[PDB]
Amino acid sequence: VFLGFLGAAGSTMGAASMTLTVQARVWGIKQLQARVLAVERYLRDQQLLGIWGCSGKLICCTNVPWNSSWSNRNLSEIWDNMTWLQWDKEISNYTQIIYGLLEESQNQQEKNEQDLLALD
Amino acid sequence: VFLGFLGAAGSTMGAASMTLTVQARVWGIKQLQARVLAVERYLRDQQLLGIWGCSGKLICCTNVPWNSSWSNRNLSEIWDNMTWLQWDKEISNYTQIIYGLLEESQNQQEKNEQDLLALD
Amino acid sequence: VFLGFLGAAGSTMGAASMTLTVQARVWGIKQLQARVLAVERYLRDQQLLGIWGCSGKLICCTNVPWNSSWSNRNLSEIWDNMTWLQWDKEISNYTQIIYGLLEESQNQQEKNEQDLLALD
Amino acid sequence: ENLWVTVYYGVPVWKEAKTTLFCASDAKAYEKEVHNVWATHACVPTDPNPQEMVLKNVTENFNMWKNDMVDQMHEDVISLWDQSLKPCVKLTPLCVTLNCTNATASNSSIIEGMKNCSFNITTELRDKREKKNALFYKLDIVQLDGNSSQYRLINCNTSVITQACPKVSFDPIPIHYCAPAGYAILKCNNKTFTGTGPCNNVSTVQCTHGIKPVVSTQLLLNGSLAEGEIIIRSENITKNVKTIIVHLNESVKIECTRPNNKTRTSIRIGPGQAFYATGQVIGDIREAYCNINESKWNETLQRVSKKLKEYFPHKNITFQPSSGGDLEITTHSFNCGGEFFYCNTSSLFNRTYMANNSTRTITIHCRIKQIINMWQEVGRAMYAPPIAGNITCISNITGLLLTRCYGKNNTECFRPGGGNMKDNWRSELYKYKVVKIEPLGVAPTRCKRRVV
Amino acid sequence: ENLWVTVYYGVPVWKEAKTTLFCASDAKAYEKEVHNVWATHACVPTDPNPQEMVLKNVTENFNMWKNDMVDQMHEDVISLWDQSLKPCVKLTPLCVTLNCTNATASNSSIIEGMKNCSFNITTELRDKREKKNALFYKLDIVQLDGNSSQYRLINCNTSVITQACPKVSFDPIPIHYCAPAGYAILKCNNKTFTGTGPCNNVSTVQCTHGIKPVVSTQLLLNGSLAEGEIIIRSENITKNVKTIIVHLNESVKIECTRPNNKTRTSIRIGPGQAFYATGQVIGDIREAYCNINESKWNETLQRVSKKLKEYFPHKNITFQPSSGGDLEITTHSFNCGGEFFYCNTSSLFNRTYMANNSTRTITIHCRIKQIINMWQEVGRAMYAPPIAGNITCISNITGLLLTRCYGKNNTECFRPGGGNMKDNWRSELYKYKVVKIEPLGVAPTRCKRRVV
Amino acid sequence: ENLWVTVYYGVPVWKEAKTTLFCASDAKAYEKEVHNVWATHACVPTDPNPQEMVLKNVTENFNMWKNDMVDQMHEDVISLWDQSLKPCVKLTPLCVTLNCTNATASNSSIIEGMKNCSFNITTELRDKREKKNALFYKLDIVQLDGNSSQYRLINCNTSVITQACPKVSFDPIPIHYCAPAGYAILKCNNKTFTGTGPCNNVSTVQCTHGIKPVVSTQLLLNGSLAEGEIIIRSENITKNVKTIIVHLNESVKIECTRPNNKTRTSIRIGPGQAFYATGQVIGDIREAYCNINESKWNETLQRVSKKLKEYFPHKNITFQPSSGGDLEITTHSFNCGGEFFYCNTSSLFNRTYMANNSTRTITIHCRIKQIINMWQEVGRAMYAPPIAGNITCISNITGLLLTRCYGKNNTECFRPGGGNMKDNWRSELYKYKVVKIEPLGVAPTRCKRRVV
């Protein structure tokens, strides 16, 4: 059953994380351009997850330690009490940095797996 | 070597399950529409599998128990006789339901993994 | 982050295997044809990996033994000696054979996993 | 300590951005056997239901006076006329000199506003030309600078005229705007939202409600009604360059009729092309007129003055009639029954206010015109073929496109007449907004990935 | 008990649905220096090999009289002519009054069916016009309602005319239809399949075999042959509204020739444009004719009567010639050698049958025509320039587009003449069907997923 | 032993192949209110920075004389004129007979190369036509046979003419080519690469540098300079069928001017269409001329002879002037200031060489022409409206499109004049190459996959 769409916006991040699959789910050339836009915008975000090892996971935990240079809160009391839009307005300053760390971490794991199984 | 295509139609469900990879494998804006149709129809069926945890598997076993409200068969000898097309004519009544169960099951597993590894 | 696009070319194979993520990362109709070409050329190579079990791995090790009927080298002293171009000019004769072996190997693993978990 | 990155997908977050919006239509297509009215010809993804899904706690900004959707609406509205006039007959062969005189209705009574012209035109055989005749309104004709009996079509010395195909009769079929996959069309439900500033009751939809692509100048007829009381909108009410869109919560019925009858006649221009001129006029001499319930107009102007002086409580408010000039800008216009009206609205905007229903119907006399220099374009025109039989029209006024003048006195001024045609559609798309979802996020948590 | 869901991908299952089919062409393209014949110029993709793959034990339904492929074929065939006549010269300047008289072949012998016309036309300089002359068939000319010596082109009082470019000479190049990725083109191999009802020997292909885009009216010439004996097809043989497509397993050779010679002359219409008309006619006076081996036709009609009366064994069967009317509908037609024919087939369909090879050649006299109101469209026409030298043509009849009439007598009636032009292409695409694959399925099994 | 297959992704390997290349333009696209110059109107994407990334050890093959990019450049350059001349006025109504005489500048002095023509043209009213008059160059006019006072436009007896819209004035805006996602544009940095053979210093880029789409015939002006000394290129220097592109490392300044004013006058052709012709000529009688620093030309020809005889050390080298015939092929051409020049270069190519800067300026007299049979097409033409005010132009020669003739004597021959126009753009895209990446590979290693 269709659960609507985007309804978890404005709620605490803790509650919104259980509806991720809702958001994840012909006037000629203009309409075709819209279709290609949708396809490529999905493929970009879906490839950007494979590089980090989270190939098919909505929620993924990865090996890159946090530090206070980026956004810093007591995120056990402020994990909730914060809402996704405000969070993005908070941490949008440092994503371009986090992506490289995640990429290098994934490369490390793949190289390690390739080397270790040489003994098997 | 190309093994033809769709040649396992009819036959039996048991036999056809060993050649799944056969089916898985300029005239204006009319033809580009066909190209985009192919791409998007593939992406639909390939994203619909990621939501269930079956990210890259042709045959995938999952956590949703069966019950006789849907199709009911012995499928000890019937599994090797159905055949596939008769099966689709049989169980098409309830496919719209199974997807929600699979989605909920996958969300359960992802949340559980994210919670458990917090103790690591 | 950006690190050029093709600098690892011309370097030895062993060294170039650590920069894989660099290579992996109104006219109207004229641009749309190119866009669709890019999308479909990427999807081809990203599905051909899924068929082999290597769904989201840049480097992937698999079950198909090597034999000298294909290209033959020591590739212990010669590994990290040739650059990728010479190697491609060398082994290009037999890829169409290797792909079928990989496909059959993946089918075997999927069938085995489906059978074994029936006893779970 | 012990906090590591974790990446979420499907995060519900968004950011404003312009995008290419679908063009849709009701599955109830063109009623006359689907003979390719513009909305039915191209824009026909069938009736995407607006599954509105309220958002619990969102606070979102809106800005109607600079939104992305109005420009797309205007471009589509202009363009869909070109795609429908292209195959119709060009009237270039008809821009010949005319020998024209006065017309007469029954009993040889001179019918003011018409002229019986005659001209030479080439028949099916390109070597033979004959003398035909037709009746043109005085507004489709410009007297040649010479003898008083020579005339020429008003528009055929600047651009190329094209007759409107009778089989594609234009009509305000509603149009639904839907964002493509990936985007989302928000909207505001605060029923006193003044067109700018944040709304605390946002909600999303697949598509906008049916939006009528009406064309008019000063009365935004057949529009949608506000849910509260009369609302006033402007980017800056004080500044005169901005149209003061008044929005009515009470519809005021208006009628307009053309009692005369028209004799459509066919003049052949060449191979397979027909030109529908106007022959003899049937019925007695009249001028097309419009009616308004004077009680309702008195009440509505009282209400608009009441609401408007809340921004100028220390001043009297004086409405004024249209200044003057081209009929294209000084007269309430519309296209009832396939023939364009041009109404004088001086009698409706002379009431004044100080500081501190079937009766007395008002009448206003409306010109009529055939060769339209369509508001949608400059440097090209169109010809509206005559419509047989008398035409009656009923519609609901739901807004005023006022604008304030600089009167010498210290009290306020407001006269009809908008400065641009975009304000017609900015009275429907003042709710909506279009955003792009960015479902990839990163946050810290108490987890690190497994090593195996 | 202990049964859980499991999802398979790549399941071989399908469901009927319409789709947009590729258009392909043989790698053996139009090779007169490849001057862009419509087939390969537009339908670029080259010769996809039909890798047929039989399907074991499949039972599939077919319905030729309502399939999705025929409409696409008809639309593509109509459209491919428009995309090739667009650049060619328009003959609008030539629709002028004509002063025309009888023509004469050698020895001043009057030639029937021709008329030596002369007319005024503008030369390269737009201020000068001269009196040229050319010869038109009597069927391209309609006498003006007046003096007997005035004439006008038949078609230039309803629609425009465009000459066919000589460099894009039309020809039945085969056309391969391929479904896009995801779909699959099935087909039937049962060699006595009657056009509707299930087939027990289905097979799939990448594409259809080469399909010739022939144009003809009553003899389905140059077609493909059935593999068994003569087959009869119809949605309902009893009902008269449905064409009874008879399909021949035995080709009957037919020849047609135009013994006269033609003089092609060039008349200039203006800048660059050239108009090719017929000057003096060379050779002796003749009428184009066609030949059929009478023994073979006797045998083939015997066979068709034998097969047809199995559905009406009670009573005799009578063939009848075409009733009458426009040559466009009452006569066999084709386009051999670039010039259209219109053959009278009354002598071929007068044999009757009761209840219970180089000899005696038959001859039928065929008109010729130039200004074709192409069957593909109404409200427009085309001009086929004259072809020099005598033209001979040979082709294989492989069908009849019969249709039954309501005779007063107590025996059956069947006369040539189809009711629509789609039946030409519904004799090649009566095998195929197009289906969309749905490779996702679910099923129960004795497995549940791991917990780790 | 113990070696198994392993599949890599993102492998850096490539193979040559043709593809469709983006068209881009500088973010400094156009500044005269962005009135749609073809580069800004079509090549929308903005300034993709060429992030060059050298390759450490690649050895790659190049072949300029058969690369895939030049053909795309030629097709785009041809097609971008059609997309801009389409809306402009057709001069078909102007192809009428002309009564023309001699013109006269001030003091009734006969002006050579001009003729005062008068002709009849239809005014805004299609029933009236009047006798206008304008002045045409002798090269836009062909005398009608016989009488010496009748003339006709040179081009309007073969094809249609279209005036160039003054609002879209053409200019060499640079054009950036960017291969689409998945491809890569290599290039060679060896600063003495001779156009064919391997390069040992390859590097890649997102796009090519700004490339000026210059149009010229024999001096390859406003080009880019080589980084070393003078280079010589050819597929086979010995064979005469191949243009010998000489490439200069030392720019030689050239000036060209039109020392008199033109009176632009507007003649109305019909509804909303204007035709700008040349009325009275203002200023004194002159012939547009060009200047070159004789010292620099002497030095540059010395250098080119020095470099050229390294391939022919045995015998002297003789330059020769253009053979003769049509001005379209035997004269250096360009379009400075919106008017097309046609210069005689016989005085610049008569020097000879044996075996073993503000002074002495050279002058060459240049014709001017309006009706251009643009090199981009044959069978169609263009009209360049006259430009008011004297026009001065300065540009940097950076190459020569020589070609060798078969002189009877025993020494070499080289005369200006290329055989095709592609050589203009093959002097900029001789570095680049386009390849498709194939990021999938297979190699052996000491691993086998896990069993779990």
Q: Which residues of E285-310 are buried (b: 16+ CB within 10 A; e: fewer)?
A: beebbbebbeebbeebbebbbeebbe
Three-state SS letters, F387-415? CCCCEEEEEEEEEEEEECCCCCCCCEEEE
- Region of A28 on the Ramachandran plot (φ > 0 left; ψ -120 to 50 alpha; else beta): left
Structure tokens at F344: 């005689």
Contact E97 D127 (CB under 8 A): yes
Q: Positive or negative CA dihedral for E185, E191, E197, E202?
A: negative
SS3 state of residue F11: coil
| 3.90.79.10, 3.40.50.2000, 2.60.200.20, 2.170.40.20: CATH of E1-71+89-94+164-212+428-452 | 2.170.40.20
**Half-sphere exposure in the Cβ direction for C42 (13 Å, CA):** 20
What is d(CA E388, CA E339) in angstroms, rounded to the nearest whole number? Answer: 10
DSSP letter (8 states) at residue D42: T
Using a CB-CB cut-off of 8 Å, the residues of chain A touching D58 are: 9-10, 85
Q: Are F123 and D96 in contact (CB under 8 A)?
A: no
> How close does chain B come to D71, measured CA to CA in Å?
26
**Side-chain-facing half-sphere of A11: CA atoms under 13 Å:** 16
- Indicate the residue type of C53: G
Determine the residue of chain A that is closest to C59 in CA distance: A110
Burial class (CB in 10 A: 0-12, 13-18, 19+), D35: middle
DSSP label at residue D403: B
Q: For tokens 């970009």, what's the residue?
A: A44
Residues of C whose CB is below 8 A from A33:
32
How far B45 CA sits from the closest chain E CA (Å)? 7
Q: Which residues of D touch E158 (CB under 8 A)?
A: 271-272
Are E252 and E396 contacting, i.e. CB atoms less than 8 angstroms apart?
yes
Pairing, β E289-292 against β E317-319? unpaired
DSSP per residue over F276-319, as a string? EEEEEEES-----EEEE-HHHHHHHHHHHHHHHTTTSTTS-EEE
Nearest to F345 by CA among F258, F417, F412: F417
Mutate to test the interface with B, among A2, A43, A58 (most CBs of B within 10 A): A58
Task: Find which of D1, D3, D4, D446 to mutate to test the B interface (most B CBs within 10 Å of its CB).
Answer: D446
Which chain D residue has its CA at the smallest distance from F450's CA? D452
Q: Partners for A (CB, 8 Å, 3+ pairs)?
A: B, C, D, F
Q: Identify all chain D residues contacting E156, using CB atoms and an 8 Å cutoff.
A: 124, 271
CA atoms within 13 A on the CB side of D444: 22
Q: Which residue of F has its CA nearest to C101?
A: F5
Look-up of token digits 């009574």: D109
Phi first, then psi, for residue E65 (nearest 5°) are -70, -5
Residue F308 to residue F310: CA distance in whole angstroms? 5
Both structure tokens of E68: 């999705």
For helices B28-50 and A29-50, give the axis angle rounded to 10 degrees.
Answer: 30
DSSP β-bridge partners for residue E395? E254
Nearest C-alpha neighbor of E140 from the set E391, E321, E339: E339
Instruction: Evaluate whether F319 touches F414 at the Cβ level (below 8 Å).
Output: yes
CB within 8 Å: A99 and C56: no
Q: Cα separations (Å) of F353 from F239, F298, F301?
A: 21, 11, 9
Q: Find the radius of gyration of the CA atoms of chain B.
A: 18
Q: Say how many residues make up chain B.
A: 120
Q: What is the resolution of this structure in A?
A: 3.9
Q: Are F450 and A116 in contact (CB under 8 A)?
A: no
Taking the CA of residue E81 as centre, how many other CA atoms within 13 Å lie in the half-sphere pointing to its CB? 23
> Is E99 in CB contact (< 8 Å) with chain B?
no
Token pair 């779990």 is found at F452
Nearest to F339 by CA among F143, F123, F162, F164: F164
| E124 neighbourhood in chain F, CB within 8 Å | 95, 156-157
Q: At what angle do helices B28-50 and C29-50 cross, to 10 degrees?
A: 30
3-state per-residue secondary structure call for F192-258: CCCCECCECCEEEECECCCECCCCCCCCCECCCCCCCCCEEECCCCCCCCCCEEEEEEEEEEEEEEE
Checking DSSP bridges between strand D109-122 and strand D98-105, what pairing results, if any? antiparallel
Strand partners, D281: D262
Beta bridge partners of D186: D204, D433
Return the H-helix or E-strand segment holding F24.
strand F22-24
Domain limits, chain A? 13-119
Residue D213: Cβ within 10 Å count: 19
Residue E305 DSSP SS3: helix
- What is the pairing mode between strands E352-353 and F391-402? unpaired
The helix (H) or strand (E) run that includes residue D392 is strand D391-402
Q: Which alpha helices (H) appear in D208-343, and where do they start and end?
A: 294-308, 327-330
Q: Does D241 touch chain A (CB under 8 A)?
A: no
Is chain E adjacent to chain A, meaning 3+ CB pairs within 8 angstroms? no
**Cα distance between residue E75 and residue E20, in whole Å:** 12
Separation between Cα atoms, residue E452 and residue D452, nearest integer Å: 12
Taken as a whole, chain C contains a residue count of: 120
Work out the minimum CA distance from F178 to partner chain C, whole angstroms.
11
The Cα D431–Cα D70 span in angstroms is 11
How many angstroms separate the Cα of D95 from the Cα of each of C117, D75, D92, E293?
86, 30, 6, 63
Please compute Rg for chain C using Cα positions.
Answer: 18
Measured CA to CA, the distance from residue F333 to residue F367 in angstroms comes to 10
In 3D space, the residue among F374, F116, D150, B9 whose CA is nearest the CA of residue E186 turns out to be: B9
CA distance E8 to chain B (A): 5
DSSP β-bridge partners for residue E352 = E318
Q: How far apart are CA D248 and CA D252, in angstroms?
A: 9
- Do residues F195 and F370 touch, judged by C-beta distance below 8 A? no
Measured between beta carbons, the chain A residues lying within 8 angstroms of C17 are 111
Which residue from E9, E23, E180 is facing B38, i.e. has the nearest CB?
Answer: E180
Tell whether B114 is within 8 A of chain D (Cβ). Answer: yes
Distance of CA F413 to the CA centre of its chain: 25
Cis bond before residue F392 (omega within 30° of 0): no
Long-range contact set of residues E417-421: C-beta below 8 Å, sequence gap at least 24 = E417/E217, E417/E218, E417/E322, E417/E323, E417/E329, E417/E330, E418/E217, E418/E218, E418/E243, E419/E241, E419/E243, E420/E243, E421/E74, E421/E215, E421/E375, E421/E376
Asked if D444 lies within 8 A of A75 by C-beta distance, the reply is yes
What is the C-alpha to C-alpha distance for residues E130 and E9, in angstroms, rounded to an integer? 76
Tokens at F425, concatenated: 């753009």
Is residue D204 within 8 A of residue D408, CB to CB? The reply is no
Task: Find residue E371's DSSP bridge partners.
Answer: E383
Structure tokens at E205: 């292909």
| Torsion angle defined by CA atoms of residues D190, D194, D195 and D197, in that order, rounded to the nearest 10 degrees | -80
Q: Write a three-state SS string for E177-224.
A: EECCCCEEEEECCCCCCCCECCECCCEEECECCCECCCCCCCCCCCCC
Q: List the domain boundaries for chain E.
A: 1-71+89-94+164-212+428-452, 95-163
Planar angle of CA F63, F66, F72, nearest 5 degrees: 120
* Cα D222 to Cα D219: distance, rounded to the nearest angstrom: 9
Count of CA atoms in the C-beta half-sphere (13 A) of D22: 23
Q: Where are the alpha helices (DSSP H) in D263-420?
A: 294-308, 327-330
Give strand pairing partners of E342.
E333, E367
CB E269 within 8 A of CB E275: yes
List of residues 6+ apart from F206 with CB closer than 8 A: F48, F49, F50, F51, F178, F185
Touching chains, C (3+ CB pairs < 8 A): A, B, E, F
Q: How far is E122 from chain C (nearest CA, A)?
A: 40
What are the structure tokens assigned to F52, written together? 């060059």
Burial class (CB in 10 A: 0-12, 13-18, 19+), D195: buried
Tokens of F261: 């004013």
Joined tokens for residue D33:
């056997």
Task: Confirm if F318 and F412 have CB atoms less than 8 A apart.
Answer: yes
Task: For residue D367, report the phi and psi dihedrals to the nearest 5 degrees.
Answer: -65, 170
Which technique?
cryo-EM
Count of D–E CB contacts within 8 Å?
Answer: 28
Neighbouring chains to B with at least 3 Cβ pairs closer than 8 Å:
A, C, D, E
Classify burial at D256, counting beta carbons within 10 Å of its beta carbon; exposed 0-12, middle 13-18, buried 19 or more: buried
Pairing of strands E274-282, E332-334: unpaired
Distance from CA of F24 to the nearest CA of D (A): 21
44-83 in chain F: CB under 8 A from chain C: 44, 51, 53-58
Q: Do the Cβ atoms of E57 and B10 come within 8 Å?
A: yes
Is the Cβ of E118 closer than 8 Å to some Cβ of chain D? no
Residue type, D7: V
Note whether D449 contacts B: Cβ–Cβ < 8 A. yes
Cite the DSSP H helix spans in E224-351.
294-308, 327-330
Residue F314, both tokens: 């045995």
| Contact (Cβ atoms closer than 8 angstroms) between residue F6 and residue F16 | no
Q: What are the start-end ranges of the H helices in D188-229?
A: none
Looking at the DSSP assignment, which residues form a beta bridge with residue F199? Answer: F60
A46: nearest Cα among D167, D25, C50? C50
Could you tell me the two tokens for E250? 């035995």
E131 touches F: beta carbon within 8 Å = no
Q: At B83, list the tokens.
A: 């055949």
User: B85 in contact with C at a CB cutoff of 8 Å?
Assistant: no
Supply φ then ψ for residue D233, to 5 degrees. Answer: -135, 145
Does C119 reach chain B within 8 Å, measured CB to CB? no
Breaks (C-N over 2.5 A) in chain F follow: 356
Q: Cβ of D10 and A37 within 8 Å?
A: no
Asked if D296 contacts D391 with a C-beta cutoff of 8 angstroms, the reply is no
> Do B23 and E437 touch, CB atoms closer than 8 A?
yes
Cβ of F284: how many Cβ atoms within 10 Å? Answer: 12
- Decide if C111 and B59 are in contact by the 8 Å CB cutoff: yes
- Whole-number Å distance between alpha carbons of D395 and D336: 9
For residue A38, the distance in angstroms to the closest alpha carbon of chain D comes to 5
| CA count, 13 A, side-chain hemisphere, D292 | 22
Contact D96 F272 (CB under 8 A): no
**Which site among C3, C17, C20, C21 would you substitute to test the A interface, given the most A Cβ atoms closer than 10 Å to its Cβ?**
C21
Q: Give the angle B105-B107-B111 at the CA atoms, nearest 5°.
A: 120
Distances (CA, A) of D191 to B33, D195, D227, F421: 43, 11, 6, 68
Q: Exposed, middle or buried: residue E409 (CB in 10 Å: 0-12, 13-18, 19+)?
A: exposed
Decide if D182 touches B, using CB distance below 8 A.
no
Taking contacts as CB-CB distances below 8 angstroms, the residues of chain E near F158 are 271-272
Q: Look at residue B43 and give its three-state secondary structure.
A: helix
* Cα gap F344→F347, rounded to integer Å: 8
CA torsion D389-D391-D392-D394 (nearest 10°) is 150
For residue D198 the two structure tokens come to 């944040």
Alpha-carbon span F152 to F143, nearest angstrom: 6
CA pair distance D165, D382, nearest whole angstrom: 11
D9, D176, E116, E285, E339 from E105: Cα distances, Å: 87, 70, 11, 7, 20
State the nearest Cα–Cα gap between C64 and chain B, in angstroms. Answer: 16
Which residues neighbour D369 within 8 Å (Cβ) at sequence distance 6 or greater?
Answer: D137, D139, D140, D327, D340, D342
